[PDB]
């Protein structure tokens, strides 16, 4: 795995994780993020 192409993929997956986690924290109990 080359560093250049892997780091951007990791960053984009992390941003998608932030999407999903904020949206799921706006649910009932959660934290409202």
């Amino acid at each position: 795995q080359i560093g250049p192409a892997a780091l951007k993929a990791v960053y984009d997956m992390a941003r998608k994780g932030a999407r999903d986690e904020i949206q799921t924290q706006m649910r009932d109990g959660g934290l409202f993020s």
């Binding site: 799921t24 924290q25 649910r27 009932d28 109990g29 959660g30």
Partner: protein, 232 residues
């Protein structure tokens, strides 16, 4: 401590245990469909798995996110199934994307399965040995030419609900037509546009005062015919 039999706890503590199969059931009766029984595996004779006398057809299906937790969001499982040959697609265009259906999941040790599934028979078969869970379908998250994914939710899920619910209104009825609170049982009178009809399939209340008067139900009107002027 789940109400699970002593044989299951005997099998759980063994060093070398049998395979733990999971059988899924999709129940769309309450939404207008049938009950489908699925298992990810066949049996040793290449046939759908027979459990408690019911045949669970072979179909790729598996779930994740199953947990029991109280602190935080209500747990939302996820069930992934195969959409090859357009089966789920057919149900999605038919049963409003299966939304509102009931998913029942059974965990059963293969040791306790019916003797039919095995060539030599199962002297240890015990159809009472199972662990059951129920969930609802909240959203068909994905549906492609390859597979489908469903988000499950606990049947309680107090997400969009509010309390108290009944709302004060003027010139509108909050009751359900012909419901217990409405209390109406008379013949067809008019539709939702206050047009006089004698057809039972076109008989709905307009929810306005005139609609109530058409059925002589004004005493049961759900609105409050004074509050419009006190709020000025």
């Amino acid at each position: 401590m789940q109400d699970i039999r002593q044989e299951t706890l005997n099998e759980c503590t063994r060093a070398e245990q049998s395979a733990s199969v999971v059988l899924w059931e999709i129940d769309l009766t309450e939404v207008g469909g049938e009950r489908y029984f699925f298992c990810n595996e066949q049996n040793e004779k290449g046939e759908p798995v027979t459990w408690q006398g019911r045949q669970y057809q072979p179909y790729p299906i598996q779930g994740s996110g199953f947990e029991l937790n109280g602190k935080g969001t209500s747990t939302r499982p996820t069930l992934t199934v195969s959409n090859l040959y357009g089966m789920v697609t057919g149900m999605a265009e038919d049963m409003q994307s299966l939304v509102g259906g009931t998913v029942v999941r059974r965990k059963v040790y293969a040791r306790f399965l019916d003797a039919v599934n095995f060539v030599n028979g199962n002297s240890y078969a015990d159809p009472e040995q199972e662990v059951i869970s129920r969930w609802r379908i909240e959203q068909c998250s994905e549906l492609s030419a390859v597979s489908a994914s469903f988000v499950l939710s606990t049947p309680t899920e107090t997400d969009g609900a509010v309390f108290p619910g009944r709302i004060m209104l003027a010139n509108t009825c909050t009751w359900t037509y012909r419901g217990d609170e409405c209390g109406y049982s008379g013949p067809a009178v008019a539709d939702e546009y206050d047009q006089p009809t004698s057809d039972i399939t076109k008989d709905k209340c307009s929810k306005c005062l005139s609609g109530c008067k058409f059925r002589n139900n004004v005493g049961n009107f759900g609105g409050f015919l004074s509050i419009n002027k006190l709020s000025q």
